[PDB]
Design a protein around this nucleic acid. Structure first.
Ligand SMILES: CN1/C(=C/c2sc3ccccc3[n+]2CCCS(=O)(=O)O)Oc2ccccc21
Lengths: 224, 212
RNA sequence: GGAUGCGCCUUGAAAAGCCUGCGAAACACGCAGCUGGUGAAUGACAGCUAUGGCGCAUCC
């Protein structure tokens, strides 16, 4: 079997005025017999349709805000669709999704599968990896809270898990905030039973791909 | 270009409420309209296609309707996991266009935050900056006042807040406030406190620690 | 997995154009026949044959 999948790649930080290409690797169907669309979402903003390519003919369509700078294409041998972006501007910063227009018979012209999305940040600024500091539980609602602070990184995003993924209950990973330094920071917290602070281990796994930073920080109480 | 405009742009409704969202095309589009649900930072999920057909696997509480150039998404009885931004989209003519989105928030009963305070780590202190973190956990409504005090003086301009998305089961929020100080200033003072005011608290709740 | 049975889709409309169903199908490309109905410019079709699919039920 081959399950239908769309896997996007190519996102990251790029200087303005340059060129960057996104890829959308399809599995489970034949990409040249389907319609593929690109749709983007600027942080905090709405969905914006960007471009599409038609099955069998390969006819291409574009939004005005994008026409003449972007080129959508498909490669049958790679089963992969592409969005080539040229003369990048800050207004192009967004999460970019590829999507498959579904089967007319089953879903009309609705988009039935989507990629995971990938962030393109168009900025002159440089890449900085994060520092990861513990948020230790205190000595004093029945439970205890602990976490880790992920400070001074750029660009977005960062991913945080706890105990390699074994700890998901009670986790809150906050939206990043842009500091006045122009770097991001965020915290991830989890609430756990106070009785288990001596016994259970709590490790915060932080990944910042644009800087190849992988960190695992243990979080224990202070001796005091 | 065809323009799609949803109303309202945001709404708050209780569990079990009937919610109706409307979307108007500026030109004709002949029911080539789909509705999507998007959780924050996640890919949208198709709900309705061809104006009124329920997509395979979508719960029956979602329906779509057409009347001329006006299209309606109905949630028959709102569920806590329905918190999201909902988008209409026309695919009658290129370029395709999405509506601006309507954000749906779950209205629930008042829930008071649990407050935690976190001193900077020695590890960070070696670096010349100190971050003090105040956590407001699992509260409703979203509006809350966090005030930092250092040796009983009110702080201003040196904190930032972030708030989670609504929880998918209990519809509550959590909030972090981070106070940023130079190591120099941090070492000059003893008492660090965050005072929280919220509808669910009869009087402000203060969490503090003494440096050292 | 094997048998059988039921249902459904496999357009409609014609000079042009427009609209519309199906073919993975918004543009481009492709879509056989019968009986009745409709059209003096109107999608308006009903029941089927053939060819390709799809779902449900029974039975071993
Ligand atoms: C060509 N033409 C046309 C022909 C018409 S109207 C009509 C009405 C009832 C029955 C037959 C019929 N017929 C011909 C049938 C032959 S066939 O098309 O079935 O092969 O009417 C037109 C009006 C405006 C412009 C051109 C027109």
């Amino acid at each position: 079997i081959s399950e239908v999948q769309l896997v996007e790649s190519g996102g990251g930080l790029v200087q303005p005025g340059g060129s960057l290409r996104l890829s959308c690797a399809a599995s489970g169907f034949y990409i040249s017999y389907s319609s593929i669309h690109w749709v983007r979402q600027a942080p905090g903003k709405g969905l914006e349709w960007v471009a599409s390519i038609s099955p069998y003919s390969g006819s291409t369509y574009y939004a005005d805000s994008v026409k003449g700078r972007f080129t959508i294409s498909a490669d049958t041998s790679k089963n992969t669709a592409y969005l080539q972006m040229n003369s990048l501007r800050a207004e192009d910063t967004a999460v970019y999704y590829c999507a498959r227009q579904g089967y007319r018979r089953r879903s009309g012209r609705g988009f039935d599968y989507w990629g995971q999305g990938t962030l393109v940040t168009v900025s002159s600024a440089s890449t900085k990896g994060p520092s990861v500091f513990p948020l230790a539980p205190s000595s004093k609602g029945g439970t205890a809270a602990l976490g880790c602070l992920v400070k001074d990184y750029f660009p977005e995003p960062v991913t945080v898990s706890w105990n390699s993924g074994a700890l998901t209950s009670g986790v809150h990973t906050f939206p990043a905030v842009l500091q006045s330094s122009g770097l991001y920071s965020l915290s991830s917290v989890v609430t756990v039973p106070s009785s288990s602070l001596g016994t259970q281990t709590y490790i915060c796994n932080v990944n910042h791909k644009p800087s190849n930073t992988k960190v695992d920080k243990k979080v224990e109480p202070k001796s005091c | 270009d065809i323009q799609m405009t949803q109303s309202p742009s945001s709404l708050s409704a209780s569990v079990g409420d009937r919610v109706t969202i409307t979307c108007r095309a500026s030109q004709s589009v002949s029911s080539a309209v789909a509705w999507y649900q998007q959780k924050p930072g996640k890919a949208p999920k198709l709900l309705i296609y061809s104006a009124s057909s329920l997509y395979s696997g979508v719960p029956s509480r979602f329906s779509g309707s057409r009347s001329g150039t006006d299209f309606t998404l109905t949630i028959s009885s709102l569920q806590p996991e329905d918190f999201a931004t909902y988008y209409c989209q026309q695919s009658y003519s290129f370029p395709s266009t999405f509506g601006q989105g309507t954000k749906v928030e779950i209205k629930r009963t008042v829930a008071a935050p649990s407050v935690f305070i976190f001193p900077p780590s020695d590890e960070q202190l070696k670096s010349g900056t100190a971050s003090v973190v105040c956590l407001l956990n699992n509260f409703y409504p979203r509006e809350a006042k966090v005030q930092w005090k250092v040796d009983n003086a009110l702080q201003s301009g040196n904190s930032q807040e972030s708030v989670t998305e609504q929880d998918s089961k209990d519809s509550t929020y959590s909030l972090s406030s981070t106070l940023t100080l130079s190591k120099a200033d941090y070492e000059k003072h003893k008492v660090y406190a965050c005072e929280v005011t919220h509808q669910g608290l009869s009087s402000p709740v203060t969490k503090s620690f003494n440096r050292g």
